[PDB]
Design a protein around this nucleic acid. Structure first.
Lengths: 53, 276, 256, 50, 276, 51, 44
DNA sequence: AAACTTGATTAGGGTG
DNA sequence: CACCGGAGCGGATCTCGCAGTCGACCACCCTAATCAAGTTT
DNA sequence: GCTGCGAGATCCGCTCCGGTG
DNA sequence: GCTGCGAGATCCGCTCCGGTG
């Protein structure tokens, strides 16, 4: 995921988990702030769940 | 090829390619060949998010807004979601107080029931939010770096500014020309069946009348069992609940399981006889 | 077409064109044409007033029939500003016609012109109708009363102005829970269904017509006007009866 | 109306029949599949036929 | 009833609306009601140019190029039009001399027959142009500030930079990673039938051969004739031309009138008997 | 289910859960008042299963 | 998957179950599992 | 005479 | 033996970046460091 | 004297094989 | 708890009317 600062997108971050799915955007937690966030799919780089595990 | 795979895997780990070329050249089944880059780190990393997204038709009187800087003129724009009739007004500053007054005006023009609007501070302001609340209205947040949730207002900023460029010499006032554009696209733009948005809003206000909805209560309810077939064999009636409305060959129903409206073809319906 | 049957009833009873429309579900400009064409009794039609409150000139708009209104704060009663205001006001609506007094902004040449630019019936004159004038009076009284309620509660005069506009146009209701908004709206529905369906199409046409007696076609009659051409039907007054009639287009010879 | 389309919302579809009003969606037949379905009322644009 | 029209016309000249609302409210035929805004200035002038455009894969050995700044690295990119096999190389400066050397290298790798390239000065340079000429090659100009004629090279700048982001940590050299991307998409990207571009270029070089290609002259020619129907009635036969190639039910032919290849269904053909 | 006023049978209500089968009656909640209730089996009509 | 998938290929030579059973054990592709059982001469 | 709270006026973070 | 289901692949649909390095200066809303003004044990 | 197609995710239209009232 | 849509200009197909041996 990433985020926009004066529009300028963040780096790809985490990664972390899809909490609530929605079409084109979702809910996720910010690990840093421990806080839920809504992220634009464009800025959502999808991953399969198991990661290395 | 089943045991070609770890080498092909290596060749992704080396040379990092598509599931296809790898699939074909190593001649395998392709699908786990996709599970490669699912399981790759590298190629998993740098791919883009193909994602279509959606905008909300949403609700009657549900609304969307953004301010404008047309020729260095702040113009705050009042734009419906569902049938997309609009309004706008030129403003001197974007500020929450000013904004709050503007929306008092426009809100008073209608019964607008809700909103999408961005992270602009005036939209966001405390007493602004409390004002939506004060009036029992749903603000919703246009989100960071999505004008696209703010779609229609930006769209219309296009349309409008084209029309401005026509009309403004015809007038003393820029804002009478603003009235002219406002007029036209809320009215004079008419299409499909040759109808404005104004048609549709207003019509639907007639359509959304509460008394009629309350009145239809007298009409009969039946309940109905729906049920589900596993290897051909239909479940118990799941449950039994009201035929919210019947169609031909199927109906309207809710799964309490989803708490969401649903269909059942009339064969998988049980019609449930009346009291008597 | 229910239009000639409504005409049959009005020729008897002499009601209001309101209740003709309402009773028979016909058009209201049909109905208004009846009462204007009914010698016995012989929409989107408005009236304005500027008004001063708290040293604030306010423009007002008052529909003559629904009684629904609008008003807006004004810097000055000038023609030009007002021309903007009627741009915006016409923006909020699809107004047909108007009343007012002879106020200078109203009567002004570019203003009257602008009504013509909009294809509107403007009427300035000493506004004479106690139907209208009573309602305009009730409006302004109720209005500035409701200002006097609301204005403390709000950051803006024009927000509370908005408030009163809500109160009267929306929150204020009567009968079956109809605000003049609901009225106006409902009128726009069938009226803009009939207006599109009818007035745009053909005008000033004559025809010959006949009446089937047990399905046996009558002699050809008239020449008379084609008053409202319907879908597979028309509307015509038989001159002898002084009564309107539905005629099927097959029993019409349109006079070119 | 509009549904899955290519992904999520497709391009608009119908004009169809407004059959039953609910909250947030309603069921209309697919002329293509002759099939009754649902469209989120945010995937709807309501119309009078004529 | 078309004499409402000049007033309706005025009402466009005044109030500038759609052909429809005008059509209906003035109740006319609509089509000239569209010819209004065709003939309007105001509602016209400001319309946009709906235009699809096209790119040219073109002939074999026809090419397309642009420099790319990757991470502040000039990389000049050698990209085919037709089957779109590519090459690229990192460069220190974009300059015409440098460029000229780069293309000497790459040109020497192949028999590239022609080019599309933009207004960049090195592409444009005098002796560059003279070098294309010196070698009997067709440069063509990517027009200014249209990358879209330069489509594929910018496309591939996308593809490549994704692959860079994978591979570059795997290497000492950025330019060995450049080799890696180069490798992969000129090869390892394989699709459809599981073939690279390299397949197709090289294959076509085998099919671009002159001798088998020139050998076919020995095969017979016939000529053949055609005619045209005006209100259903076919013209005289408009002469005899070689049946460039026959198909089933039709053929290959040229109209000298257009100087362009063409079809005739075999019924509208005259077969022209042999010498003998 | 229905309920009586001065013996006058009220309109039928539900359909609902048989909350418990009794003898001569059962248990039912009023969805309206949110209250468990008993209804004599004559003021009940049991609903057959999906068949 | 592709870490599971070889290991199940190792394990079927030991334990020779259904392709089904390994699909459902390891969460692999079933059709690949089937390819093993076919390519496993032992169940053949 | 140390500390303790609150109002005022310019410096940074999210949005057109 | 007919009907439904899990697994598979060709085809179809939707969104988007390649265009050199990107910021400079606005306007609004929300949050915060710092200074000035009172008392109180 | 020249033209936006390509990489990236999702999903319906089909078939091959297995289970069973 | 939030989701891209509409305006402009072309291009092909269907319908009604008229001409050709």
């Amino acid at each position: 995921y990433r985020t926009r600062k004066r529009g300028h997108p963040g780096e790809w971050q985490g990664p972390t988990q899809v909490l609530w799915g929605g079409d084109g955007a979702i809910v996720v937690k910010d690990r840093g702030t421990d806080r839920y966030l809504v992220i634009a799919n464009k800025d959502v780089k999808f991953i399969p769940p198991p990661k290395e595990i | 090829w089943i045991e070609n795979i770890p080498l092909a895997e290596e060749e992704h780990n080396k040379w990092h390619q598509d599931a296809v070329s790898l699939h074909l050249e190593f001649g395998i089944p392709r699908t786990a060949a996709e599970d490669i880059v699912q399981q790759c780190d590298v190629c998993q990393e740098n791919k883009m998010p193909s994602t279509l997204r959606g905008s909300n038709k949403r609700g009657i009187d549900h609304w969307q807004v953004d301010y404008t800087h047309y020729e260095d003129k702040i113009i705050l724009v009042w734009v419906e979601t569902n049938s997309g009739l609009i309004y706008a007004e030129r403003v001197k500053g974007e500020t929450g107080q000013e904004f709050r007054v503007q929306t008092m005006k426009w809100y008073a023009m209608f019964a607008p029931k809700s909103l999408q609007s961005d992270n602009g501070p005036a939209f966001v302001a405390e007493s602004t939010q409390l004002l939506m609340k004060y009036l029992g209205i749903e603000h919703t947040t246009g989100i960071p770096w999505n004008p696209q949730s703010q779609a229609l207002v930006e769209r219309t900023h296009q349309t409008l500014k084209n029309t401005l460029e026509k009309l403004i010499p015809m007038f003393n006032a820029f804002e009478s020309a603003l009235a002219g554009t406002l007029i036209t696209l809320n009215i004079k733009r008419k299409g499909g069946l040759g109808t404005s948005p104004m048609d549709i809003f207003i019509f639907n206000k007639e359509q959304q009348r509460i008394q009629q909805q309350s009145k239809s209560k007298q009409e009969k309810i039946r309940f109905c069992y729906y049920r589900t077939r596993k290897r051909g064999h239909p479940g118990e009636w799941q449950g039994p609940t009201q035929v919210l409305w019947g169609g031909d060959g199927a109906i309207v129903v809710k799964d309490r399981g989803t708490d969401r409206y649903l269909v059942i073809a009339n064969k998988d319906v049980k019609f449930i006889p009346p009291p008597k």
